[PDB]
Design a binder for this molecule. Structure first.
Ligand code: MG
Ligand code: MG
Ligand code: MG
Ligand code: MG
Ligand code: MG
Ligand code: MG
Ligand code: MG
Ligand code: MG
Ligand code: MG
Ligand code: MG
Ligand code: MG
Lengths: 60, 171, 59, 172, 100, 116, 131
RNA sequence: AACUGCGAAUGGCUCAUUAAAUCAGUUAUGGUUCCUUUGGUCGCUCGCCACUUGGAUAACUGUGGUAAUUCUAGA
RNA sequence: CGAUCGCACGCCCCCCGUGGCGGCGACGACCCAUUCGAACGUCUGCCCUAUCAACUUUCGAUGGUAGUCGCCGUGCCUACCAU
RNA sequence: CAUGGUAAUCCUGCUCAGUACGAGAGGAACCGCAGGUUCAGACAUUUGGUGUAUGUGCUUGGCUGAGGAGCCAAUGGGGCGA
């Protein structure tokens, strides 16, 4: 799974590839335009809340 | 595997330019000093067009065959008049001669087929519109005094024979 | 700061074009050097002489 | 995976075109080797890794794993700077174009191999490590030498030397 | 309570085991069916064989243990789940009226 | 601990319970028990059956905003540039206005002189 | 790989089921089931995913009086899917295949059971939805 | 390049349908609609932005997904 | 019941001195007329067949009344009647 | 524990392996894995069947003055059912 992470206040969107399902289980069972804490993405993302803007299916 | 194979075949397999220098005399039955022979040796995509049909692969429809072969000289385009000349054709006689423009030039991507407007020398290209004026082999040229190509030397011969007859005799 | 994500702010390619939007950005009240308060984008390519391009204001 | 007509835009400049045909004895994996080449490369061709590829483009060919009609493909690939350094022939850019033809290596010597070598300048001779040089390998090599083809060898099916035979490295 | 469940519930179904009673001591949960009626004494014995197949020597990790009522078509796992789903009833309403 | 399903009656169907019904038109239904599946198969309306959650919901039985503008730099005018431009309030804006006034005045006088 | 688990059969010999493909047959009359060793007095029976021999009773004359291999894709008998779901369909239906499990038709109306789908990849391709 | 506007309902092909149907001539719409062209009407109403008001999206930069399409997402 | 765009540009200056005024257009419009039409109707006219002589009318068939719908007239459709 | 009874059976798929063998076409087996058939011994968590708990609704004819509550019609009928 990949994550298109964008910070509008500075732009500079970038892609982060995440494999461990423990990181994505906090994202699972959510909807679009919902804010979730990214603290499960290691210590580097502590203090970060991110809104699920969209995505693309396995087939695009 | 593909990376290793490509990085060795690019290094060691020869280009058409270097290959046709020593290969022209083995595929062309005309004298080496001839303009067509020199054009084959140089592989210039401007001069005496020289294409040899090796295969006739069936098309999507049942009856028609793409005439697949190699261009040794000149530049084949779409809808240019060329002299379809068969294996038995001699330049002196009119037997096994046709002046016929070709319909379309295509490139075979295995399962896929992709049309292309033109193909210069030193490449493989299928031609549509040649099979009905030709059989089992042939050559294509824009040279009026063109000689034929040397025919294939098959290692085997049509040995095994079978008599065939329709189940319904009236067919 | 996330490396390369939350830092190194990139600029917008182009500023306001409607005179109302220029006044809104620069806190202009009314009729003060509006055509010269517009943002001029500098083109400075190496193969050509440098110059600055100004947008055609609207309204 | 570029446009089709850029193949014309590449074949305009020679010394980067490789007219190559793959020849071997029956069941020496020439079809699968060309499948790997198709999978990695491709101008409009795919990148599927699932066994069979554009070698056997017909019924009762991959139904019984038999190449009958010689099949031609055209592939494009851009090489790295060290690769262009390694190549010793003439080089016009990194955009190398390969005209690949597989032929039936069956023991009847199906004359489509003769046709492919008439069209071809360079042969990839495939041999099994555990089968050695069989009959049709010698036959197709003889035809290539008669037609002035440049041969390059490939020892195939090393996996059965590894695990099916369990050979020590000195024996291999 | 399995680690995938984390519910404060015992092996006893809602309403107790039918025709047995309430299980309070240690218990052994065996795969499949066992001879005898309910509250029939069973003798458990070590295997006389050597367990070498893959069916044996396999780690059984339970995700969920059903505790719905077996005295009919039970549809709730715990008393608290039933109360939370069904809300207050007439009995609870009059009980709260008496409690005040 | 599988996916948790819902019924004709809207009740929760735990794993190992009930039956799943796959209709020919592609619709898939699951029921808690034969009482629910008989009502569904007899084309009975669940909103007219008092113990169904659809009835208890139809009859009502038992039961942000913000506007944040983030300032950004633009090509040609940095954040400090636009700050210096928008902080021209202390009489600098008036100075620009009066120099525009005198520029217009001198342009008009020059136009009058050139015309006459 | 994976082998199909046992399911409740519910379609003995003599059952007439719908023919869900666009072949032109309306129904299939099951005359036997493949792989049935048999027992005395026991009718051979088939579930979803099973290959039967069938004759079409209603349909085109060029199909009608002949034996065809067929595969059952939907059954009305409830069967347990190893995860506790008991699944049954609105009708019994199958499709006409050859000896290689390749469909004679080109489309299937209605759902196809998962047990039949993963056992027959050719039927799964032409299946509309999988139940 | 893209947004906006217009055109794409013309032309071309064929004659399967169609027996008071189509169609030909005649007449009516005071029983209807009509892009466009052209000609009228646009100060006809008494009733703290007008020296000109608000917001968004393209194009564009950048991050992608899909084997694939004149597929498209987020910023 | 014009918050639109182009072209050369000029007049008034008392009050003044920065404003007020002007020509040629293009685009735009609610409605009217015209052009192009379109749509539905009026009268009359069509090949063979009676081994097709009685059809239509439950389910609109013919007409009336009042409606619905349609751009409009009308069983176009609905309800109630007449046959 | 003397003695007596006695029981398990067969097949398919994957892998081996497009392998051995064969010029080619074709094409195995041992180990291992996953499941079936027939049989056996159980069992009722689940699904289904039964159902006079004569449990609870509905309902026909009659009867108790009516309501309420019931009953009779050899189990009145029917739905759901521990
Ligand atoms: Mg403007
Ligand atoms: Mg129970
Ligand atoms: Mg019998
Ligand atoms: Mg006709
Ligand atoms: Mg004994
Ligand atoms: Mg026995
Ligand atoms: Mg009664
Ligand atoms: Mg009463
Ligand atoms: Mg009595
Ligand atoms: Mg009696
Ligand atoms: Mg019942």
């Amino acid at each position: 799974m990949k994550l298109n992470i964008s910070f509008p206040a500075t732009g500079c969107q970038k892609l982060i590839e995440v494999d461990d399902e423990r990181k994505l289980r906090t994202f699972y069972e959510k909807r679009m335009a919902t804010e979730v804490a990214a603290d499960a993405l290691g210590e580097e993302w502590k203090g970060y809340v991110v809104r699920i803007s969209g995505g693309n299916d396995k087939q695009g | 595997a593909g990376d290793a194979l490509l990085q060795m075949i690019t290094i060691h397999l020869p280009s058409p330019v270097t290959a046709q220098k020593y290969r022209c005399e083995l595929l062309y039955e005309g004298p080496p000093d001839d303009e067509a022979a020199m054009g084959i040796k140089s592989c210039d995509p401007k001069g005496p067009l020289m294409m040899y049909i090796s295969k006739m692969v069936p098309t999507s429809d049942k009856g028609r065959f793409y005439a697949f072969g190699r261009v040794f000289s000149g530049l084949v385009s779409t809808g240019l008049k060329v002299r379809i000349m068969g294996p038995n054709y001699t330049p002196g006689k009119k037997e096994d001669l046709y002046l016929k423009p070709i319909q379309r030039t295509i490139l075979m991507m295995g399962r896929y087929v992709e049309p292309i407007e033109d193909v210069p020398c030193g490449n493989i290209v299928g031609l549509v519109g040649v099979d009905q004026f030709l059989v089992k082999t042939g050559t294509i040229t824009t040279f009026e005094h063109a000689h034929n190509m040397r025919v294939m030397k098959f290692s085997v011969s049509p040995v095994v024979r079978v008599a065939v007859e329709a189940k319904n005799p009236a067919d | 700061d996330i490396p390369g994500l939350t830092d190194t702010t990139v600029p917008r390619r182009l500023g306001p074009k409607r005179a109302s939007r220029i006044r809104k950005l620069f806190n202009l009240s009314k009729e003060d050097d509006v055509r010269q308060y517009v943002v001029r984008k500098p083109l400075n390519k190496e193969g050509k002489k440098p110059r600055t391009k100004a947008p055609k204001i609207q309204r | 995976n570029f446009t089709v007509d850029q193949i014309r835009a590449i074949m305009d400049k020679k010394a980067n075109i490789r007219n190559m045909s793959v020849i071997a004895h029956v069941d020496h994996g020439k079809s699968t080797l060309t499948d790997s080449l198709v999978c990695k490369a491709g101008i409009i061709a795919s990148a599927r890794a699932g066994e069979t590829r554009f070698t056997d483009t017909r019924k009762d060919e991959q139904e019984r794993c038999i190449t009958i009609k010689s099949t031609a493909i055209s592939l494009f690939y851009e090489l790295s700077e060290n690769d262009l350094n390694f190549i010793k022939q003439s080089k016009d850019g990194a955009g190398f174009l390969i005209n690949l033809i597989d032929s039936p290596g069956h023991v009847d010597f199906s004359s489509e191999v003769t046709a492919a070598l008439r069209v071809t300048d360079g042969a990839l001779v495939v041999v099994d490590c555990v089968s050695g040089v069989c009959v049709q390998t010698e036959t197709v090599l003889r035809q290539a030498i008669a037609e002035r083809i440049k041969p390059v060898l490939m020892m195939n099916k090393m996996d059965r030397a590894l695990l099916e035979l369990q050979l020590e490295p000195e024996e291999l | 309570s399995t680690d995938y469940d984390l519910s404060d519930k015992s092996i006893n179904p809602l309403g107790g085991f039918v025709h047995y009673g309430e299980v309070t001591n240690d218990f052994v949960m065996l795969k499949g069916c066992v001879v005898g009626t309910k509250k029939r004494v069973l003798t458990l014995r070590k295997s006389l064989l050597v367990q070498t197949k893959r069916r044996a020597l396999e780690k059984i990790d339970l995700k969920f243990i059903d505790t719905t009522s077996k005295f009919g078509h039970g549809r709730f796992q715990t008393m608290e789940e039933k109360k939370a789903f069904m809300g207050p009833l007439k009995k609870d309403r009059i009980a709260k009226e008496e409690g005040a | 601990m599988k996916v948790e399903l819902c019924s004709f009656s809207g009740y929760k169907i735990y794993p190992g319970h009930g039956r799943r019904y796959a209709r020919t038109d592609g619709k898939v239904f699951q029921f808690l028990n034969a009482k629910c599946e008989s009502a569904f198969l007899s084309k009975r309306n669940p909103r007219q059956i008092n113990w169904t959650v659809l009835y208890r919901r139809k009859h009502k039985k038992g039961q942000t905003r913000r506007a944040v503008k983030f300032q950004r730099a633009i090509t040609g005018a940095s954040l400090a540039d636009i700050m210096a431009k928008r902080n021209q309030k202390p009489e600098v804006r008036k100075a620009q206005r009066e120099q525009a006034i005198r520029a217009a005045k001198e342009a008009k006088k020059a136009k009058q002189a050139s015309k006459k | 790989s994976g082998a199909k688990f046992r399911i409740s059969l519910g379609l003995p010999v003599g059952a007439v089921i719908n023919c869900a493909d666009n072949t032109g047959a309306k129904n299939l009359y099951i005359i036997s089931v493949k792989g049935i060793k048999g027992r005395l007095n026991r009718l051979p029976a088939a579930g979803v995913g099973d290959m039967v021999m069938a004759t079409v009773k209603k349909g085109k004359p060029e199909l009608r009086k002949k034996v065809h291999p067929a595969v059952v894709i939907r059954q009305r008998k409830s069967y347990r899917r190893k995860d506790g779901v008991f699944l049954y369909f609105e009708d019994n239906a199958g499709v006409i295949v050859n000896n290689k499990g390749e469909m004679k038709g080109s489309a299937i109306t209605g759902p196809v059971a998962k047990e039949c789908a993963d056992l027959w990849p050719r039927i799964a391709s032409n299946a509309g939805s999988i139940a």
